[PDB]
Each structure stands twice: as C-alpha cells, then as structure tokens.
Amino acid sequence: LENAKWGVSQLIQFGNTLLSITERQDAEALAEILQTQGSELALQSIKMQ
C-alpha cells in the first residue's frame, strides 16, 4: 500500500504538471495568433493612411 500510494502520488503530480503545460501552451498560441493578426491590421492601416 505504501508503494502504491507512492506511485499514485507521483501520478497526481504528473497530471497536475500536464494540465499546467497544456494551458500554458494554449495561452502561448493565443498570444502568437494575436500578434500575427495585429501585424496584418497594421499593414492595412498604413495602406489606409
């Protein structure tokens, strides 16, 4: 039971870390796509000026 509780506590740690990694990944991809479309809008605004 001590060995099993060890392994399951390590698995809890890995699941928490995987959750944090995938939400950081999603926020990073969001910021990247925001910068790309901001660049395109800046080009269009220069063409308007």
Partner: protein, 48 residues
C-alpha cells in the same frame, strides 16, 4: 496654351506599396545526455 500652361495633363506614377515585414525562428539541435559509468553501491535494492 497662350499662357504657357500645357494642354495635355501630366502622368501620375503609382507609388510603391508598403511591404509586409517577415520574421523567422531558426532552431538549434544540441546533443542529448549520454549515460555515465555505473558504480555498484553497498546497500540493497529498497535502500538505493
């Protein structure tokens, strides 16, 4: 004309369009960690 102004109008050349700036992320590739030499200790398997 009589006043020296031209009858035929002038040519209007097209200005250059603003270009789109490009960036890139070049990537590297370093080697992995290679395994060192193993030493045998004095304790049993649950202790080590």
């Amino acid at each position: 004309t009589i006043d020296g102004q031209p009858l035929s109008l002038s040519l209007y050349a097209t200005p250059a369009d603003p270009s789109m700036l490009l960036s890139a992320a070049i990537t590297a590739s370093q080697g992995g960690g290679d395994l060192p030499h193993a030493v045998m200790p004095m304790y049993r398997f649950p202790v080590i």
